[PDB]
Structure formats: C-alpha cells, structure tokens
Design a protein around this ligand. Structure first.
Ligand SMILES: Nc1ncnc2c1ncn2[C@@H]1O[C@H](COP(=O)(O)OP(=O)(O)OP(=O)(O)O)[C@@H](O)[C@H]1O
Ligand SMILES: [Mg+2]
Lengths: 50, 118, 150, 60, 49, 51, 222, 100, 114
C-alpha cells in the first residue's frame, strides 16, 4: 500500500502548496497596507518631534 | 428524493458535503492548524467533527466489547438530529458529547454529564 | 438478426429475446465482425448529439458519429449520464424525421439482472423504450456472452 | 422662537416623510412579492400532490 | 411638509395599485401552473394505462 | 537581557503578541503585563495604553 | 489483443458519407476506474481510442457537483463542430471562466483583499458551477440549455445568490416556457440566438428577477 | 481472534509495550476479563483511540476548549499508566487497581 | 553557442529570462492587480508582453483562414529583431503592432497602420 499512501501525501502536499501560495499573496497585499499606514503615521511624528 | 423523500435526501447530502469538505481540510489542519482556516471553514470543521462523532452509535452487539448497552434511533429522529447538526444548532456542545450515543435525548444526557446544556 | 423489430426489446448477445415478449422479426442478419467504414467512407462529424446535460453539451459536446468515453470510479454517475442521453433523444424521436431521430442501443455487460431491470424501468418511465434496444449480458452469463455483447 | 423650532421640526419631518414614502413603498411591494411567491410555490406543491396521487391511483 | 405628505400618500396609493397588479399576475400564474400540472398528470395517466 | 544583567539591572518584562508570551511562559520568565490581538494591525489606542 | 478488441469495437462508430446514406452511430463507452487510476491498462487503451473523455470523480460528486464531471480534464476533440451556433456563442467563455475560478478558489475567504476583477471572476465562477449542476433523469432541450448558459455567461446570475442560482434558473426556464416560448422556438428553428430574441430574453429575465425571491429574503433585482 | 500491533515508532517513543491501540483489538472482549477489570477498563481502548485522534487533530491548536484539554490530559495520563517494563508482570488485582 | 552562435544564444536566453520573469509576476498581476507592481515590474511586463506577442507569426497554413499570406523571417533578422525588442527599443509601440507579422519591416508597416 506504499503507492496509496504516496498518493495521499501528494494530495496533502498539493493542498498545503495552494494554501501557502494564497497566504504569500495575501501577505504581499498586507505589506503594502502596513507600509501605507507607516507613511500615514509619519507626518504627526515629524510635527510632534519639532 | 423519490424513495426516501426530499427531507431525508437533503439532510444526507448536506452531511456528505460537510464530511467531504472536512476530509479535504484535514491535511491543512494537520500541518498549519485550524487557526489558519477561514471562519466559515472553522465552523464547518467543528460541525463535521460533531457529525462524524454522532454517526457513531452504541450497538446492541457491541456491549460485549464496551460494557455499554446498545441503543436504537428511529429514522425520523435521525433525520431531525442531523438536520439540526448540519445547521449548527449543537455547535455549543462538546464533540465528546456526540460519541457513541443514540438519539437527541442521549445527546442531552451526555452533554449534561459533561458540563454542558443541550 | 437485425431489424426495426429490436426497438423496445431486451435481447442476449445472440439476439434472442430475454424479456419474455415473444419472438423478434428479423429484417436480416449481420456478422459480428464485419469491417468498420473505411477512411474514405466517412465525413466529418458535424451534427450535434444533444445529451441534455448542460456540462457535456457545453464543455465536451458530442457529435453524431463521435466516440465519447464516460470514465470514472464506481457510483460517480456514469450510467445516469448515458440514461439521460437516451431519454433526451425522445423529443427527436417524436419529431418523426429520420434525419433527427436517434435510435438507442444500451449494452449491459456484467451487470446484475435487477440493475438492468432498473435501467429498463427508467427508460420506460421516460418513454425511451419506444426507440431503445437493450443487449443484456448479466453477471450470470458465460464469459463468451459478456465478450460478445458489445 | 416656537416658529423657529417648528420650522426645524417640520423640515426634519418633511425629510423623514420623503424617506418613509419610499420605505413603505418597498415594504408593501416586498410583502406583495412574498405573497405572489408563496402562491406560486403552493400551486406547484399542489400540482405535485395531484400528480403523485394520480400515479398511485393509476398503479392501483 | 405638506407636499411631502401628499407625495407620500400618492406613493402609498401607487403602491396599493402595483401590489394589486402583481398579486393579480401571481393569481394568473398559479392557476396556469395548476392547469398545466394537471394536464401533465393526465398525460402520464394515459401513458400508465 | 544579557546586556542589562551585565549592567547590574533586572529586566521587568512586558509583551505584545502571543508568540513572545508562549516563549517566556516556557522560559518561566514573569510577564508583568501582556497586550495581544492587534499585532497584525495596531491602532494608536493600543500604543497609548502600552505607553 | 485487448486493445485490438476495444479499438475494433469502437471504430465501427462512424459518421457515414453522403454516398452511403449519411447515417451515423455515436459511441458512449463506459469505463470504471479504480481509485481514479486513469493510467490503468484498459482505461489507457480506451482513452487513446475515443475522440473525447468525460471524467467523473467521487470528490466532485460528494461536493454536490452533479453530474460530477471534471471540466478541467474532460475534453472533446470534435469540439464546437458538434454544437449549434447558439451554444457555441453562449458557451464560448465557459472554459476560461471555470479555469480562472478554479485558480482563484484558494482566495475564497480573501475576496475583500482581491482586486475587483478577481472577485468578479470568483463570483461568476461560483455561479457557473452552480449552473452546470443538474438533477438526475431530467435532460434539457438545446434551447433551454442555451438560455441557461446565457443566464450564466451574461452576468444575469451575478445579482442572484449562489445558493439560489439553480432554483432561479429552473423557475426562469419555466416562466419563459409558459409565457415567452417564442424565444425557445426561435432558438430551435434557427439554431442561433437573434438580437431581437436576445433583448426580449433580457427583458423577460429582468421582469422575472423583479418577481423572484432569494431564499435569504434579499432582492435579486439589478 | 484479534491482534496486538507493535510499532517501532511507538517503541522508540517510550511506549512499551509498543501496542498500537487504534488498530489493536481483541475479538473476545470483556468475556476474557474478570468482572473488576471489565468494570474499570470498559472503554479504555476507545478512549485511547479518541485521545490519539484528538492529539493528532489538536497538534497545532493555539487555544483549546476546556473539554479538549481535559481529554488530552486524561489520555496522556492513561498512556503513561499503560507503560510497563519487560519482566515486570502485574497480578490481575494490581492491574485492576492501576486501571482504576 | 557552439552550434547556433553566441549572439543567437544570448538573445534567446534574454528572451527566456524576460518571459520567465513575466510568468512569475503573472500571479501577482492576476490577484493583486497590475498597479500593485513596482515600476520596473511594469516595464518588464510591457516588454515581455511585446516579446510574447512578437513570437506570433502569420503562418502559410493560416492563409486558408485569413486572406493574409504567410511570412518567412530569416534567422539573422529574427535574432536582431528580438535583440532590439529585449533592449526596449520598441516598448513604446502598441501591443497589437506585434501580432501575426514577420520581421522588422512588417512591424514598422503595422506600426504606421496604427
Ligand atoms: N445528476 C445526478 N444528481 C443526483 N444524483 C445522481 C445524479 N447522477 C447520478 N446520481 C446518483 O448517483 C448514484 C450513482 O449513479 P449511477 O448508478 O448512474 O453511477 P455509476 O457510476 O454508473 O455506478 P455503478 O458503479 O453502480 O455502475 C445513484 O444514486 C444515482 O441516483
Ligand atoms: Mg453504472
């Protein structure tokens, strides 16, 4: 039953790959958002520093 | 639906769909954990675990192996209970409350014994 | 034996009726191993064969003269698709025009007799027995009958 | 002062009535549509019952 | 306020009329469905006989 | 912590997020206070409370 | 000679030339795979022999996709040559739409993060998958199939909730058949969807949407 | 009439005897046990199978409900209890008390 | 290079690299949107789109479908044209100008037509 378990592992690895790729793209978008928030926060920091 | 009726067929198909989705998600849960699933998928996983536990039953011929007397569930009660389960009406009960029991009365009694109210 | 009298009948791989409805009047006889139409005896498949199933008719359309395999695990709905196609041919049959009519042949190989009976009941319920012939080689038949039924 | 207060209240009432006209229109039309859908569904169910009963009678 | 109330009443009457029209269409469709399904049942009775 | 200890001080620990909470729970280091549930998208209110 | 067995059997299914009467025989061989192993000997032979394959899968069947045809791998080498003009027009975008939907399914719960195009593709694909579902023993006439695929591929199901799509379709197909059969008659007689017929169908669809009820009490208009 | 499945992976983990509880079964059941043992060990095998299932399922659960945590604790204690060194037999009464 | 020459190999490798990077960025384009990409990514996407459309050709067999006849691009012309394209010397031209044409003369002729 080695082939059967190998096929099951292939299916599991494919699902994990799909989920991880989706999470990577979502993380790219979230990086964009976080950088935007940092830029938004910058001016108040500058003014309060002065 | 023609033979068993629309209600029975629909409930059975919903149970099969939930269990199939849970089977699909089992590997992801094993590797990345449940916390990385969408909220709807978390709900479905909880429902599926409860459903799969509730499909188990204490059988008359199984007493010799467990010491627990068996039980019988009428078809109408089974359909109603699994309709309720597929809708998440028992999501608040622990999954262990659904393991090796009969109908909804057994579920309520076991849940009470486990510290929860059906 | 071959002829129009085989429509609506269940026969075994030798053409003998097994439905208990009496004799079948044979127009003529055909050898099972006559050659297929030659490469220069054909024309491109262009006429649709509507199965009535949206998935097939839109994604993998079937033309008349085509060989479309239905492949899958057990209990995946293959017999259902084929029976749906046969039932769908009923409106074309009722048209009465031979250019549109489609005669259906259902060959059952190795199925249990009650399954063939269920298929026949499904076809009758939809009025498909009027233009459908069933060649049956149930599981109890000799291996030769199962080999020859197609 | 009372005239000013009444003017403000009447402006608010005019706005809320122009909104409530549409609100009640939509509510009543939703009710009528629901009635129509229920009538159609029960007619279909009655026809299904008719055909099933006639099936049983013909079989008998 | 007076014009808004008058327009609201006019809209209410128009809603009454439109609801009447749609429920009338529903009545016609329901009777048509009943007749058509009865005809189908009769045809299947002929087939069974 | 090593630098502070070499400088004759004692660290009093505050944590933002759950992973550090688990790490220090395993290490048995005491955490005076912990704020969690906003690391992904923190607002100014959380920073104000921490400060 | 088992491959010879099946190939000699299946090459008798042919479309005869006009000289021989123009008759035809269409073959629908059935193959049962074990554990979906299409690489087995007999499945391999029959796949090589036939002009196209409909792969049915247990996982799709359990998911509610019935008939459980895997559109991704199912193929027809005859292709559009076996379709009427109306079906060719309406069904042109189905393949790419479903492929994009299967690509995007991983982002089902991140629809907000997805840009507008990706979310639109996801919703359209979900609705199309719901559309391709069909109950057993209920084949549809070519005109009804054309109208249903037209609903799917023209965005007229975009406003309909996925869980209602099926029902919507059925009811719509009923409504037309009871009040606007001229659309079906035109499709059947001309085998194409004329512009006048298309606009009449669109108006009928909009009115029916005005009349239709979502299962969750919402409205499907616009 | 049943089998005791032994695994090297369980053996190396310290589970001695390395009996795979999930797939190991006796086809005679309680009829082969004294009444006291049948009473104290009626559902031990099923409990341990469910415990292993939950332990696999909740391997990476950030937070667990109270019931699941209690089940995991009980199962871990039962697994430790079942461990036994070689050449160290227990009389039936001692086994009954331990399982109690 | 030992067979087709060093220039041919260099141009082919550059084309392959650009197309591979475009394929890699395809997922981000599809899901996050084109605007999500950097400026260099957008430049490479445009160049790769032009390159991939230029690999199309008006085939002799295609004349039976469209009245336009086929084209035969000599190897040197293809090499120099794709070398110029990889350098970004035609990035300003419309995308459609690179569809189903032969060498550089056809490219210019279709560019003037647009
Ligand atoms: N479109 C459908 N919708 C719902 N149920 C369906 C559909 N098609 C088939 N089924 C059901 O699926 C089950 C399997 O159908 P079917 O017997 O046609 O499949 P099969 O692959 O030919 O099976 P077998 O291995 O028994 O030959 C049956 O219950 C049938 O009623
Ligand atoms: Mg079958």
């Amino acid at each position: 039953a080695t082939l059967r378990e190998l096929r099951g592992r292939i299916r599991s690895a494919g699902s994990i790959k799909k989920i991880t790729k989706a999470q990577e793209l979502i993380a790219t978008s979230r990086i964009a958002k976080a950088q935007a928030r940092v830029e938004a926060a910058r001016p108040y920091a500058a003014e309060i520093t002065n | 639906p023609a033979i068993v009726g629309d209600e029975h067929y629909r409930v059975a198909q919903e149970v099969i769909r939930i269990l199939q989705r849970y089977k699909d998600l089992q590997d992801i849960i094993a590797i990345l954990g449940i916390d990385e699933l969408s909220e709807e998928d978390k709900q479905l996983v909880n429902r599926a675990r409860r459903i799969e536990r509730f499909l188990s039953q204490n059988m008359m011929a199984a007493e010799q192996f467990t010491g627990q007397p068996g039980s019988t569930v009428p078809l109408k009660e089974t359909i109603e209970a699994f309709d309720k389960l597929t809708k998440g009406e028992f999501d608040h009960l622990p999954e262990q409350a659904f393991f090796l029991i009969g109908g909804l009365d057994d579920l309520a009694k076991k849940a009470e014994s486990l510290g929860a109210k059906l | 034996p071959v002829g129009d009298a085989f429509l609506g009948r269940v026969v075994n791989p030798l053409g003998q009726p097994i439905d208990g409805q009496g004799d079948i009047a044979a127009e003529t006889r055909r050898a099972l191993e006559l050659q297929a139409p030659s490469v220069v005896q054909r024309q491109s498949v262009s006429e649709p064969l509507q199965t009535g199933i949206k998935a097939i008719d839109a994604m993998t359309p079937i033309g008349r003269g085509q060989r479309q395999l239905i492949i899958g695990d057990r209990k995946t709905g293959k017999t259902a698709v084929c029976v749906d196609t046969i039932l769908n041919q009923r409106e074309a049959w009722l048209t009465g025009d031979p250019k549109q009519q489609v005669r259906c042949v259902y060959v059952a190989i190795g199925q249990k007799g009650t399954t063939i009976a269920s298929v026949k009941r499904a076809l009758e319920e939809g009025g498909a027995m009027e233009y459908t012939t069933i060649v049956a080689a149930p599981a109890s038949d000799a291996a030769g009958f199962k080999w020859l039924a197609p | 002062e009372a005239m000013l207060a009444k003017t403000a209240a009447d402006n608010r009432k005019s706005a809320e009535q122009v909104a409530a006209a549409q609100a009640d229109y939509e509510k009543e039309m939703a009710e009528a549509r629901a009635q129509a859908s229920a009538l159609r569904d029960e007619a279909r169910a009655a026809g299904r019952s008719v055909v099933d009963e006639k099936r049983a009678q013909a079989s008998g | 306020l007076a014009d808004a109330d008058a327009m609201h009443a006019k809209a209410l009457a128009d809603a009454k009329a439109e609801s009447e029209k749609v429920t009338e269409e529903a009545k016609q469709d329901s009777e048509r469905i009943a007749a058509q399904l009865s005809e189908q049942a009769g045809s299947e009775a002929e087939r069974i006989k | 912590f090593s630098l502070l200890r070499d400088e004759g001080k004692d660290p009093v620990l505050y944590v933002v997020g759950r992973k550090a909470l688990g790490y220090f729970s395993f290490r048995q280091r005491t955490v005076v206070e912990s704020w969690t549930g906003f690391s992904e998208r923190p607002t100014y209110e959380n920073a104000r409370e921490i400060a | 000679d088992v491959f010879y067995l099946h190939s000699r059997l299946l090459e008798r299914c042919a479309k005869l030339s006009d000289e021989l009467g123009g008759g035809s025989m269409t073959g629908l061989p059935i193959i049962e795979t074990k554990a979906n192993d299409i690489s087995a000997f007999i499945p391999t032979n029959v796949i090589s022999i036939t002009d196209g394959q409909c792969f049915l899968e247990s996982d799709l069947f359990n998911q509610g996709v019935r008939p459980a045809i895997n559109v991704g791998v199912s193929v027809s080498r005859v292709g559009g040559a076996a379709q009427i003009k109306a079906m060719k027009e309406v069904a042109g975008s189905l393949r790419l739409d479903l492929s994009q939907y299967r690509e995007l399914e991983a982002f089902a719960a991140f629809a907000s993060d997805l840009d507008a195009a990706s979310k639109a593709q996801l919703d359209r694909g979900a609705r199309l998958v719901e559309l391709l579902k069909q109950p057993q023993y209920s084949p549809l006439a070519v005109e009804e199939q054309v109208v249903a695929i037209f609903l799917g591929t023209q965005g007229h199901l975009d406003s309909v909730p996925v869980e209602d799509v099926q029902r919507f379709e059925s009811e719509l197909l009923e409504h037309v058949k009871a009040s606007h059969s001229d659309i079906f008659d035109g499709i059947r007689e001309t085998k194409k969807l004329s512009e006048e017929a298309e606009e009449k169908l669109v108006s009928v669809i909009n009115e029916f949407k005005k009349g239709f009820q979502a299962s969750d009490g919402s409205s499907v208009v616009v």
